[PDB]
Design a binder for this molecule. Structure first.
Ligand SMILES: Nc1nc2c(ncn2[C@@H]2O[C@H](COP(=O)(O)OP(=O)(O)O)[C@@H](O)[C@H]2O)c(=O)[nH]1
Ligand SMILES: CNC(=O)CNc1cnc2ccc(-c3ccc(OC)c(OC)c3)cc2n1
Ligand SMILES: [Mg+2]
Lengths: 156, 466
């Protein structure tokens, strides 16, 4: 048996790699070639508890129904993805659960030479809204599991 | 994820990085490759600069933006690299126009030096003779020394330096054409890094102002003794041919193919000799050239001495028994076979003893790579004699070098065809007239043929070359 079943959601502009984050964290796989609603689950142990994380992925209100955690994934190689965070916030304010833990995610951190979003300025935005922050990379699995490990641990 | 295993692999170089960036329509792949560029050596990427900048201008916008970050980074580091980009962006444009205007927005001293040279050549259109032009040219170049040294450098030089002095008395117009080209000698001072050192100090009858046709070593010592900067160990002399009315873009493409062919034969351990001369594109109708020292056209050799090729060899090198002639002959054979493969693969036409040079060692060097491939408006007896007849043991060695040279040419045909295939992208060059110019290029390699059938190809190729 598993103790609880959380429902976290992956949103953001298409192309940030939220579909790859879903594969890396769960099935542990990443492909450069892309394709295209879908969700995948993997249970982890948190505080002596078994939690079946139900990660959702899109390509509205039904998307946010039962939503426990929120993952805003923006690209650090495309500043426009960081600009639309305010628009996605409005997307959350209107349909998402009033008490969901939003953890900002800066994917594609392996593109160190193509960085368009400052790591310190983006992390500061996480403090302005009191949201958890972390930059990941589904290509080399940097802070991939740590992202969901924290978002699932912070959900209590 | 096999593809990622390939990029992560050591087998992933700058050449293949351009391959995937040239074919892949995957934004994730393009952006990833645009990041790996920073990991490569600066030197390895520079060779494909004409390719990258060309892909940037004449391809999907999703491709150009991927290369832009790497390009901007290198421009912020090297003033020379900044100059190279600004020249190639405007030369192949007919998109990057908005980028060229910001790279130039420091390079004032350099740009002023290029315009002056090109301006000097243009005004020489009035003087109808080769002698008149050279008279006005020398007086014209003497004005440049009044504003030197300065933050100016010859990009054709294989090192950083500051142009200090210009021996105008040694300059000369090459021919009696309308927009005739002119060769100039430039005295420069080397350095650690151009973006580091400031402009050097400046220092000002009938001594060295003499113009003779002599070896490089002797022509430099004379210019040195008559030069104020000739006492510094940092001093060094360069030479470039300025063409203010010729499109050296196809010349640049031919250059890359020569270097690539040169590497292949060097890596496959095939003793073929070819000498690619550096090219510099200033625009779609101008540019400079660095001429190889101690080399003159065969036509100018048959004319100044009034002899045969074999006679000049025996006179300038020695008898058939002399070891000097043997080495000089070996240099001739390897150079012929080396450039024969170059003429066949590229389909170089308009081949005559005016476009074929000859150095002190005994090598031959082809020039003027116009009328190659699609564009268009031979083993002479004179050459066969120098190899000891058709049945000479050196002529058979010549046919053998072409075989194992063509064989090694197939083992790396991929890297070579890539150079030309990418450049055809959007270029209105005459060498890309036919719709299927790349196909004939690949078929001239004959990957389908066998080595037993290659010898027949080599033999039947030499026969028709007469
Ligand atoms: N360089 C790099 N590329 C990534 C990374 N994560 C994802 N990508 C690329 O981003 C592209 C699009 O991701 P995708 O799965 O479609 O995310 P989605 O658009 O949100 O559904 C894929 O082709 C991946 O190769 C990363 O960490 N580094
Ligand atoms: C001034 N004459 C000499 O220096 C004799 N020795 C040499 C030695 N290397 C050379 C390299 C390149 C060229 C060359 C190439 C392309 C040209 O336009 C297509 C060209 O026409 C200006 C000249 C001439 C060379 N000539
Ligand atoms: Mg997707």
């Amino acid at each position: 048996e598993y103790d609880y079943l959380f429902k976290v959601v992956l949103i953001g502009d298409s192309g940030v790699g939220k579909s790859n984050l879903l594969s890396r964290f769960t099935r542990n796989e990443f492909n450069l070639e892309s394709k295209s609603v879908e969700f995948a689950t993997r249970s982890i142990q948190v505080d002596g508890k078994t939690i079946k994380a139900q990660i959702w992925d899109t390509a509205t209100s039904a998307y946010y129904r039962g939503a426990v955690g929120a993952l805003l994934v923006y690209d650090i190689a495309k500043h426009l993805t960081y600009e639309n965070v305010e628009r996605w916030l409005k997307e959350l304010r209107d349909h998402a659960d009033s008490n969901i833990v939003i953890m900002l995610v800066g994917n594609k951190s392996d593109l160190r030479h193509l960085r368009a979003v400052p790591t310190d300025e983006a992390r500061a935005f996480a403090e302005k809204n009191g949201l958890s922050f972390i930059e990941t990379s589904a290509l080399d699995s940097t802070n991939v599991e740590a992202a969901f490990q924290t978002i699932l641990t912070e959900i209590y | 994820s096999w593809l990622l295993r390939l990029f992560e692999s050591k087998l992933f170089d700058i050449s293949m990085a351009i391959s995937y960036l040239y074919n892949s329509k995957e934004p994730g792949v393009q952006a990833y490759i645009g990041n790996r560029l920073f990991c490569f050596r600066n030197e390895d990427v520079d060779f494909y600069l004409p390719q990258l900048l060309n892909m940037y201008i004449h391809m999907d916008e999703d491709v150009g933006d991927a290369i832009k970050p790497y390009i901007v980074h290198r421009c912020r580091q090297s003033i020379n690299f900044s100059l190279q980009c600004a020249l190639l962006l405007g030369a192949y444009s007919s998109r990057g126009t908005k980028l060229r205007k910001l790279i130039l927005s420091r390079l004032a001293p350099e740009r002023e030096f290029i315009k002056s040279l090109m301006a000097i050549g243009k005004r020489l259109a009035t003087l109808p003779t080769k002698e008149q032009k050279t008279q006005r040219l020398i007086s014209e170049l003497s004005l440049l020394n009044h504003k030197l040294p300065a933050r100016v450098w010859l990009p054709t030089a294989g090192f950083d330096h500051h142009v200090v002095r210009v021996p105008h008395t040694q300059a000369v117009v090459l021919n009696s054409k309308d927009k005739a080209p002119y060769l100039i000698y430039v005295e420069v001072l080397e350095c650690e890094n151009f973006d580091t050192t400031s402009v050097p100090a400046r220092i000002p009858e009938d001594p060295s102002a003499v113009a003779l046709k002599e070896p490089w070593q002797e022509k430099v010592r004379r210019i040195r003794e008559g030069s104020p900067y000739g006492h510094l160990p940092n001093w060094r002399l360069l030479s470039v041919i300025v063409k203010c009315g010729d499109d050296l873009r196809q010349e640049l493409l031919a250059f890359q193919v020569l270097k690539q062919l040169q590497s292949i034969w060097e890596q496959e351990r095939v003793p073929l000799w070819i000498k690619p001369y550096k090219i510099l594109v200033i625009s779609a109708d101008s540019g400079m050239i660095e001429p190889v020292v101690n080399a003159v056209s065969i036509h100018q050799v048959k004319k100044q001495s009034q002899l045969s090729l074999l006679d000049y060899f025996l006179q300038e090198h020695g008898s058939y028994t002399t070891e000097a002639f043997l080495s000089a002959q070996r240099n001739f054979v390897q150079s012929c076979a080396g450039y024969c493969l170059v003429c066949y693969l590229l389909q170089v036409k308009d081949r005559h003893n005016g476009n074929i040079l000859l150095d002190a060692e005994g090598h031959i060097i082809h020039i003027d790579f116009g009328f190659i491939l699609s564009s268009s408006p031979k083993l002479t007896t004179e050459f066969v004699d120098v190899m000891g007849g058709l049945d000479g043991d050196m002529f058979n060695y010549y046919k053998m070098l072409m075989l194992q040279g063509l064989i090694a040419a197939r083992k790396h045909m991929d890297k070579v065809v890539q150079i030309v295939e990418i450049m055809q992208q959007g270029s209105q060059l005459p060498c890309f007239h036919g719709s299927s110019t790349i196909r004939n290029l690949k078929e001239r390699f004959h990957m389908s043929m066998t080595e037993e059938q290659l010898q027949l190809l080599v033999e039947q190729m030499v026969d028709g070359s007469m």
